[PDB]
């Protein structure tokens, strides 16, 4: 039985599967702050599912055969191109930021669906709740217009209101000069072009907005660079959290059922990420969209609904 009101009535209620270990943990920080490694260790020690940070091709990893699609099917938005030319005339900077917010929104729904349906917690690397720091940094450097910021806020207001914040927010506080050294040692040519003012804006937004906001509704663990190295000590911190605040205490089977019906319906999750607001950065002409849409349907296993593609070995189609 696919989840629905009938499954709820017969007994599929969230409070049955949810224990004291059913938590949503988000790991945040600046670029090259060690989030990824810390997030992977926390997930493994606490026995939760790990979600690698949602990038450009996150959605491809969840549909089809899970492999990245050509870049025309992500809008041609490029993170490398954002570093080379943050002020591109083709609106790549915001188009990339709008694409990334939608990818995070989708990942958050997937994380919530996993948590509500199995009771196993999850670990994320940044989320819809902290994605705005990049937008604020982009705007203060002049990489995007105030209108792009307005569009981002319109989409956020009508999307982030539907979900619950993470139980635990883990922040790794690495100062900007150290990050600049870390980015420098990493080696990839494009990321070396990040300016310190850009990284300071990410930090200023993280501490000036995200953390004060999250504190009122989540458990926040703020670690320095050295404390963060030993994931065992972070796990010990999480294990003795009281969990005395936030909107999760007010949740009941009735409310989590309504939430589950949303996060399992991805087209409903993404509904407002394509609101008809015509910014040049994100507006696609009808001739371009038509061509790309045709090519997408000609990919292996994408013409039909999953399980009805004979080109990739689906059988019993005449009975399915």
């Amino acid at each position: 039985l696919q989840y629905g009101p009938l499954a709820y009535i017969l007994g599929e209620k969230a409070t049955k599967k949810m224990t004291e270990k059913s938590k949503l943990i988000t790991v945040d920080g600046n670029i090259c702050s060690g989030k990824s490694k810390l997030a992977k260790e926390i997930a493994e020690k606490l026995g939760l599912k790990h979600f690698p940070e949602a990038g450009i091709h996150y959605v491809d990893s969840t549909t089809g055969d899970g492999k990245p699609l050509p870049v025309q099917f992500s809008g041609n938005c490029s993170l490398e191109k954002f570093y080379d030319d943050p002020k591109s005339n083709d609106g790549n900077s915001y188009r990339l930021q709008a694409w990334l917010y939608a990818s995070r929104l989708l990942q958050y729904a997937d994380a919530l669906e996993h948590l509500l349906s199995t009771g196993q917690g999850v670990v994320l690397e940044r989320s819809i709740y902290s994605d705005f720091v990049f937008l604020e940094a982009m705007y203060r450097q002049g990489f995007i217009r105030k209108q792009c910021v307005d569009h981002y806020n319109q989409v956020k207001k009508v999307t982030i209101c539907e979900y619950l914040p993470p139980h635990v927010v883990v922040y790794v506080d690495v100062p900007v000069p150290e990050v600049q050294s870390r980015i420098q040692k990493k080696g990839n040519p494009h990321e070396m072009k990040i300016t310190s003012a850009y990284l300071q804006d990410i930090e200023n937004a993280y501490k000036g907005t995200f953390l004060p906001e999250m504190s009122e509704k989540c458990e926040v663990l703020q670690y320095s660079a050295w404390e963060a190295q030993d994931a065992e000590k972070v796990v010990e911190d999480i294990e003795y959290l009281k969990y005395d605040k936030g909107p999760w205490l007010d949740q009941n089977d009735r409310k989590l059922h309504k939430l589950r019906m949303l996060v399992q319906d991805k087209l409903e999750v993404l509904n407002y990420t394509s609101i008809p607001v015509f910014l040049p950065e994100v507006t696609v002409g009808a001739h371009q969209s038509d061509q790309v849409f045709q090519e997408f349907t000609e990919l292996p296993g994408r013409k039909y609904r999953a399980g009805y593609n004979e080109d990739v070995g689906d059988k019993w189609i005449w009975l399915k």
């Binding site: 319906d265 509904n271 990420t273 394509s274 609101i275 994100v282 507006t283 696609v284 969209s289 849409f293």
Partner: protein, 347 residues
């Protein structure tokens, strides 16, 4: 709302309507309307926002006022006949009050102001019930009292409804308000033919409900409530744009589609009674409905509007909405004309 509570409330909406349709006693008819009104308000408030609160408040005030007028008519009828049987009324003042009360419940002009606002303020699923199922009870009552209805009053309400419904839809960009003004116009055709052949009223009602359900279901499938959000449908589900086009053409009454059948039969019954001016006026005025149906087809199916980059992320997921009965409804909405003589089943 708990899923079991939602089902019980929906069954109470239907039970109230069914009570009206099986009752031989005016008191039970009035009870049925009250029970129906009681159970629909929580469906309007189900999303709990200031617009739904305003919508439900405006609906309750209008429906509760109409029920008072209805009960007044029943009591006057009791004084002048000493009985409660659901049938022709025995006092012309009782007939005026009951007719005005039923017109209020139907949202016919000039009692129409609530329909565009209430429909806009509630979800698509709730608007579907409001504009289809909720017409059954008031119509079933008119079907029984029409011998005592004042001919000038009912035809005045019908004409004003066709004009105001047609004119009102011209200025709308919101889909729910477009459906609301369409409903006002279609109500006019239903009650225009009522004094002449009530069977044609039922055919128009049945065909209208099918087409209206088809449109609301297609809007729900894509979660579209504005003209512009519906203009992205070509870049997601091309098949749906074609079904929308066919239904909209059908609702406009164009041959050889089903929606032409009620207009065809209503003109026939009116001309048989030497009513020539009125059916000609109604058909020409209905061209306003076709105009703003056609605008939707232009922005939905017959052109390709600009899209957004984030839409590409939608290509990778299938439609998950139930879309119950939609394949059957759209076929019935468009392909029924060769079976028109089947209307005798409604006699």
């Amino acid at each position: 709302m708990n899923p079991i509570i939602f089902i019980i409330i929906l069954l109470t909406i239907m039970l109230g309507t069914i009570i009206v349709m099986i009752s031989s006693h005016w008191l039970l008819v009035w009870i049925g309307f009250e029970m129906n009104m009681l159970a629909i308000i929580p469906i309007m408030m189900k999303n709990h926002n200031p617009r739904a609160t305003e919508a439900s408040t405006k609906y309750f005030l209008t429906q509760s006022t109409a029920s008072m007028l209805l009960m007044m008519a029943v009591i006057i009828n009791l004084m002048f006949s000493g009985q409660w049987t659901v049938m022709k009324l025995f006092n012309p003042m009782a007939s005026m009050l009951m007719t005005m009360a039923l017109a209020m419940k139907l949202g016919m002009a000039p009692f129409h102001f609530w329909v565009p606002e209430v429909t806009q303020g509630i979800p698509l699923s709730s608007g579907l019930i409001l504009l289809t199922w909720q017409k059954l009870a008031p119509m079933s009552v008119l079907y029984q009292i029409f011998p005592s209805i004042n001919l000038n009053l009912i035809l005045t309400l019908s004409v004003l409804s066709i004009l105001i419904g047609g004119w009102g839809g011209l200025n709308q960009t919101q889909l729910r308000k477009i459906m609301a003004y369409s409903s006002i116009a279609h109500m006019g055709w239903m009650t225009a033919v009522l004094p002449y052949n009530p069977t044609m009223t039922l055919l128009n009602l049945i065909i209208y409900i099918i087409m209206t359900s088809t449109m609301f279901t297609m809007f729900m499938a894509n979660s579209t409530t504005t003209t512009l959000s519906l203009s992205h449908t070509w870049n997601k589900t091309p098949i749906m744009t074609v079904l929308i086009l066919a239904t909209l053409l059908s609702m406009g009454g164009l041959p050889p589609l089903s929606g032409f059948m009620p207009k065809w039969m209503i003109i026939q019954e009116m001309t048989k009674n030497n009513s020539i001016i009125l059916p000609t006026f109604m058909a020409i005025t209905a061209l306003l409905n076709l105009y703003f149906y056609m605008r939707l087809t232009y922005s939905t199916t017959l052109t390709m509007f600009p899209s957004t980059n984030n839409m590409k992320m939608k290509w990778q997921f299938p439609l998950m909405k139930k879309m119950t009965f939609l394949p059957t409804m759209v076929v019935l909405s468009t392909m029924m004309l060769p079976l028109t003589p089947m209307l005798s089943v409604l006699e």
